[PDB]
Design a binder for this molecule. Structure first.
Ligand code: I3A
Ligand code: I3A
Ligand code: CL
Ligand code: ZN
Ligand code: ZN
Ligand code: ZN
Ligand code: ZN
Ligand code: ZN
Lengths: 160, 160
């Protein structure tokens, strides 16, 4: 990465995850595969949901291979096996779940099906229900506060 | 931009600003020069404040030239003159002020000196005090919710 690329990537990685180092492309890949597995869970993941996930991943400034490989990835592997590919991703259980919630929300408000999926995955991930409930709440609050931001900045027309 | 670059830049621009189109590099530049002018306002802008601003801007996937030029930019121009350089940035007064608040907070909690500056710039921007107070409150909420997220995701160890 260029120094300017590293500036943007470090900032955004720190912004969303609190990290003081940019994850390896390999780790970004494994993390996103986990997220997609989690969001898809039993069922399917819609194009819109997958597109949001890929866009989120691209924003971190990952190498192109990571996105091209996610595009063709069939998230049909066992979630516990995926996370075990990396010691770093294997610390990321709550982080993965939260991103999976946001991905699932991308194509509309969470249905009971999607709430059921997330809990099935949280069980696989070893996350207690109280924590799952807190992560869902955090999602709703984050989504609501973003909407509040946008409506305050641009109540009428937006330039772009 | 490549399709993958557009993917990530679109995503992050929509995420922070609600925009459906990536701004031109010139508009990103003019916006950020306005933010830096606002943050500096009366007085001075610390290296840490400026670094946060540059990293924020770089995270949108702007061309390198934008960042290189912001590095040497002396934010000594009149705020209303900078914003008038773009019809898009001329709609962005509240957006600029919120980013300026975040920039000011990057090197520590807002002092009454910074709060005084913000209001001086808001007057130049034509923003009413009630709205200034709302933007500052939004900043506090956003910063607190982010801390909450990070403590919930990684209460003990973090992978990166
Ligand atoms: O790469 C992005 C990312 C976000 N959270 C985690 C956690 C562990 C490895 C990588 C990542
Ligand atoms: O370029 C980033 C940006 C964020 N808000 C606005 C508003 C107007 C022009 C550009 C921008
Ligand atoms: Cl998010
Ligand atoms: Zn969904
Ligand atoms: Zn939709
Ligand atoms: Zn250059
Ligand atoms: Zn400050
Ligand atoms: Zn007031």
């Amino acid at each position: 990465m260029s120094d300017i690329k590293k500036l943007g990537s470090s900032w955004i990685i720190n912004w969303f995850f609190g990290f003081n180092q940019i994850p390896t492309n390999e780790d970004s890949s494994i993390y996103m595969k986990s997220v997609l597995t989690c969001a898809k869970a039993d069922g399917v993941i819609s194009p819109e949901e997958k597109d949001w996930a890929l866009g989120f991943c691209a924003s971190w400034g990952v190498a192109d291979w990571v996105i091209e490989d996610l595009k063709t990835y069939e998230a049909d592997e066992a979630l516990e096996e995926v996370i075990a590919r990396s010691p770093q991703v294997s610390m990321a259980q709550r982080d993965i779940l939260l991103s999976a919630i946001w991905v699932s929300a991308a194509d509309g408000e969470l249905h009971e099906k999607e709430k059921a999926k997330i809990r099935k995955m949280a069980t696989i991930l070893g996350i207690k229900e109280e924590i799952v409930d807190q992560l869902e709440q955090l999602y709703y609050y984050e989504a609501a506060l973003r909407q509040k931001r946008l409506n305050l900045l641009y109540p009428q027309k937006s330039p772009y």
